[PDB]
Amino acid sequence: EQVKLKKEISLLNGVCLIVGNMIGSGIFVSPKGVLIYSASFGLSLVIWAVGGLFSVFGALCYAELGTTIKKSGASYAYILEAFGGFLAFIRLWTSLLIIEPTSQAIIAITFANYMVQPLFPSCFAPYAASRLLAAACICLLTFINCAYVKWGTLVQDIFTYAKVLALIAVIVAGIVRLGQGASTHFENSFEGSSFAVGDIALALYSALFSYSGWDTLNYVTEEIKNPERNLPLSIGISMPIVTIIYILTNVAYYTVLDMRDILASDAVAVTFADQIFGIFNWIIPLSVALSCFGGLNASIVAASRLFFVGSREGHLPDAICMIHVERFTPVPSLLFNGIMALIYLCVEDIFQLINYYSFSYWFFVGLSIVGQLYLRWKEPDRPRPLKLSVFFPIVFCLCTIFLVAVPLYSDTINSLIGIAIALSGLPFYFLIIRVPEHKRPLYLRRIVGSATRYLQVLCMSVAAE
Ligand SMILES: CC(C)C[C@H](N)C(=O)O
Ligand code: NA
Numbered sequence: 456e457q458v459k460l461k462k463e464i465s466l467l468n469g470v471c472l473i474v475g476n477m478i479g480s481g482i483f484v485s486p487k488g489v490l491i492y493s494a495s496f497g498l499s500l501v502i503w504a505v506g507g508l509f510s511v512f513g514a515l516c517y518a519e520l521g522t523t524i525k526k527s528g529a530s531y532a533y534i535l536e537a538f539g540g541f542l543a544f545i546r547l548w549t550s551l552l553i554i555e556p557t558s559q560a561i562i563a564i565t566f567a568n569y570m571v572q573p574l575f576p577s578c579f580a581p582y583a584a585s586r587l588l589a590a591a592c593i594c595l596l597t598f599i600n601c602a603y604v605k606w607g608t609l610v611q612d613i614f615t616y617a618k619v620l621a622l623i624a625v626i627v628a629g630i631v632r633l634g635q636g637a638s639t640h641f642e643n644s645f646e647g648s649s650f651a652v653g654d655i656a657l658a659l660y661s662a663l664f665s666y667s668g669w670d671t672l673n674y675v676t677e678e679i680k681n682p683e684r685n686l687p688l689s690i691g692i693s694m695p696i697v698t699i700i701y702i703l704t705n706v707a708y709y710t711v712l713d714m715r716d717i718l719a720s721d722a723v724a725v726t727f728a729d730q731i732f733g734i735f736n737w738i739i740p741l742s743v744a745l746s747c748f749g750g751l752n753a754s755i756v757a758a759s760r761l762f763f764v765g766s767r768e769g770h771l772p773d774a775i776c777m778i779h780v781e782r783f784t785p786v787p788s789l790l791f792n793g794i795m796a797l798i799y800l801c802v803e804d805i806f807q808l809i810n811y812y813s814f815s816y817w818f819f820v821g822l823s824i825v826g827q828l829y830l831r832w833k834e835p836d837r838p839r840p841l842k843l844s845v846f847f848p849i850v851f852c853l854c855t856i857f858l859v860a861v862p863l864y865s866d867t868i869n870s871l872i873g874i875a876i877a878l879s880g881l882p883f884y885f886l887i888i889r890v891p892e893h894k895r896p897l898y899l900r901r902i903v904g905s906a907t908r909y910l911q912v913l914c915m916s917v918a919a920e
Contacts, residue, residue, distance in 0.1 A: 458783065460678050460778055461783050462678055463680075464604075464675060464685075465685070468612060469689030470696075472672050472757075474618070474668075475615035476671040476753035480747050480750065484723065486708065488662075489506070490717065493649060494647040495645050496644045496709040498648040500702060503701055503705055507662070507698035509854045512847045512851045513855070514669035516824050516848050517673050517823075518690040518691065519827065519847075520533050520673070520827050522841045523838075527761070528674060528761045533823040534819070534823055541884065543768075546822070547762075547771070549877045550758070551771075551795065551880070557799055557805060557812065559593065559796040559799075560797075564585055564805070565743070565747045566592050567586070573741065582803075590797055597755060601789045601790065604784050607755075610749070611749055613749075617745040622700050622704055625708075626703040629711060633706075638710065656857070659857075668753070671753055724743060725740055755792060758792045759792050774903070782915075785916075786915065787914045807869075812873050812876070814862040
């Protein structure tokens with residue numbers, strides 16, 4: 456045949472990618488970010504609905520963008536199309552240095568924690584055991600995605616089914632508790648509600664942070680069986696599912712747990728399970744583990760394809776595209792991503808890094824949408840299969856301006872450190888990537904070419920063609 460990443464993604468695989476990467480484990484463990492800043496059950500539910508609506512706006516923007524540009528790499532390929540080079544290398548680098556390795560490593564550590572949780576419910580799980588299970592999970596998922604692409608989509612589908620079945624168990628338990636008559640929590644809700652622009656803005660911020668997995672399928676979009684039809688349809692099938700699941704899962708939590716017994720909880724779903732299931736309360740930490748497995752597989756697929764496209768341009772070394780000659784899977788990109796994710800596992804406290812890259816993440820999303828608006832102004836008659844109204848790009852541009860202005864006045868020093876990360880990768884751009892390949896150092900090209908030729912047959916990868 457021809458060495459090239461085949462399509463090998465259906466509509467169901469796309470819905471499962473988006474849903475498994477958007478749900479994750481922040482609805483089982485910490486769904487109390489909206490409830491802290493909105494002191495009511497009713498107001499927190501309304502803010503969940505409003506955040507879901509604004510995330511639907513952003514996801515419609517990204518469906519339009521993905522059918523317009525049609526290149527893998529969610530915001531990298533959309534900053535590279537409207538803007539170029541600069542601001543696309545920075546985002547790619549940001550994702551390479553901090554965003555993707557931290558995200559993955561944290562998902563792996565959470566998987567390990569909630570795998571060993573049923574036998575460590577009160578005490579702390581060991582640090583070495585958590586890190587070794589996280590490393591084993593990252594290695595297994597990187598290998599499964601290095602073997603075949605259909606294996607990666609299959610694992611994603613299985614563990615997304617597991618996610619939604621656990622969340623449907625939670626939702627059904629909550630709705631049954633409501634139906635027996637013991638509501639007593641929505642009896643007089645909207646009572647302690649805090650109505651202040653600060654606390655409502657922070658609740659909206661937490662809600663919009665909860666839905667952060669709709670650009671997933673925009674990373675693997677050269678690998679969809681019919682992108683012009685399976686990107687918008689997959690996104691518009693996955694947004695209602697995740698929104699309704701979030702709202703109904705919070706309804707279940709609020710039905711069973713009172714506020715006290717829900718803000719002092721280290722893992723809400725777990726408490727919910729301990730309080731309603733009795734024994735078989737271990738189903739929920741196991742389900743958080745399976746949820747993190749699915750989310751980590753989605754993260755690995757997305758990051759591997761982002762680095763594939765990064766090196767397909769002049770940004771990363773052109774030994775990262777390098778599709779496998781007989782499996783048609785990006786082996787060097789997946790290996791590089793897994794190595795970078797296993798390096799961050801050695802960091803003891805790895806959530807300060809979340810605090811480092813929050814602002815940069817939402818800045819790059821907003822810059823992708825601004826690039827969409829620019830591509831609507833410049834080059835208007837460029838082929839657009841989905842030409843949505845200019846209302847969704849504008850509304851989510853404002854919403855991401857808000858999501859980026861919150862961390863720039865709340866924790867202004869961590870956002871500056873994230874900016875430092877990006878423009879600290881910048882010195883690789885003005886001396887290696889900006890210079891033509893023929894005048895850059897002869898010996899450095901020699902070394903890189905030899906290393907590439909020695910991880911070529913090793914990865915059994917001949918890149919494109
Ligand atoms: C999309 C993910 C990176 C975030 C996800 N909503 C969570 O469970 O925390
Ligand atoms: Na996102």
